[PDB]
């Protein structure tokens, strides 16, 4: 009930009932601020990575709820796991889950967004936007874009720089702004381009300048006024 190794064992169980009991134990450990060692935290991150694909609905919803406490308690020590946390949550957010479950993903995303350095979050988001080892659905794109937009409202101007990756990401967004299959992508992409422009105008102007006449003018029609 209070042993860390055993709680993590129950979370890693192939049996759903045991995973449920483990998450209850883990939640208790977090509420009681029972601290984890470094290798315990590493093991828990590995368990949670797999939990993103948990086939049992109750276990998965309980996992999403536990994430809030987990992130809040261990955010200082979770920077190396941030890529996995954020990208997996955005995939879940774009998977068209039931309303009640989407709320829990959104909540976990909101907690993430306020718990980690902005530049680090932003850099993960730029790489994820271009990520070539996968092909995002329309709803995954929406979720990525909405998150960018919200992150842009809390960022420092110098968190956004004219680099190759950020240039490669903004290019993709430009075209997604003309997206015929989804009005939601359209509005989300525009808001992203708008927010990044208003965040750091000069650095965004430099970005546009280093793009072909297609992306440059396409964005120009939007950014006026």
UniProtKB/Swiss-Prot annotation:
HEAT repeats lie at residues 58-95, 120-157. The two SXIP sequence motifs mediate interaction with MAPRE1; this is necessary for targeting to growing microtubule plus ends. Phosphorylated by GSK3B. Phosphorylation by GSK3B may negatively regulate binding to microtubule lattices in lamella. Microtubule plus-end tracking protein that promotes the stabilization of dynamic microtubules. Involved in the nucleation of noncentrosomal microtubules originating from the trans-Golgi network (TGN). Required for the polarization of the cytoplasmic microtubule arrays in migrating cells towards the leading edge of the cell. May act at the cell cortex to enhance the frequency of rescue of depolymerizing microtubules by attaching their plus-ends to cortical platforms composed of ERC1 and PHLDB2. The chain holds residues 645 to 869 of 1286 of the full protein. Belongs to the CLASP family. It comes from Mus musculus. Highly expressed in brain and at low levels in heart, kidney and lung. It is found in: Cytoplasm, Cytoskeleton; Cytoplasm, Cytoskeleton, Microtubule organizing center, Centrosome; Chromosome, Centromere, Kinetochore; Cytoplasm, Cytoskeleton, Spindle. The modification Phosphothreonine is found at residue 135. Interacts with microtubules. Interacts with MAPRE1; probably required for targeting to growing microtubule plus ends. Interacts with ERC1, MAPRE3 and PHLDB2. The interaction with ERC1 may be mediated by PHLDB2. Interacts with GCC2; recruits CLASP2 to Golgi membranes. Interacts with CLIP2 and RSN. Interacts with MACF1. Interacts with mtcl2. Interacts with MTCL1. The gene is Clasp2. This is CLIP-associating protein 2. Residues 1-225 are annotated as: TOG 2.
């Amino acid at each position: 009930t209070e042993d860390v190794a055993e709680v993590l064992n129950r979370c890693a169980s192939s049996n759903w009932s045991e995973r449920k009991e483990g998450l209850l134990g883990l939640q208790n450990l977090l509420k009681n601020q029972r601290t984890l060692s470094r290798i315990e935290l590493k093991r828990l991150c590995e368990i949670f990575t797999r939990m993103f694909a948990d086939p049992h609905g109750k276990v998965f919803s309980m996992f999403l709820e536990t994430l809030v406490d987990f992130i809040q308690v261990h955010k200082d020590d979770l920077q190396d796991w941030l890529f996995v946390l954020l990208t997996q949550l955005l995939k879940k957010m774009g998977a068209d889950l039931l309303g009640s479950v989407q709320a829990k993903v959104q909540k976990a995303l909101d907690i993430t967004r306020e718990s980690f350095p902005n530049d680090l979050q932003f850099n993960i988001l730029m790489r994820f936007t271009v990520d070539q080892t996968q092909t995002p659905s329309l709803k995954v794109k929406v979720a990525i874009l909405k998150y960018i937009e919200t992150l842009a409202k809390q960022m420092d101007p110098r968190d956004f720089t004219n680099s190759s990756e950020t240039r490669l990401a903004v290019s993709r967004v430009i075209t997604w702004t003309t997206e015929p299959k989804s009005s939601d992508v359209r509005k989300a992409a525009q808001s992203v381009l708008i927010s990044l422009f208003e965040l750091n105008t000069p650095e965004f102007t430099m970005l546009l300048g280093a793009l072909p006449k297609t992306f440059q003018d396409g964005a120009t029609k939007l950014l006026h006024n």
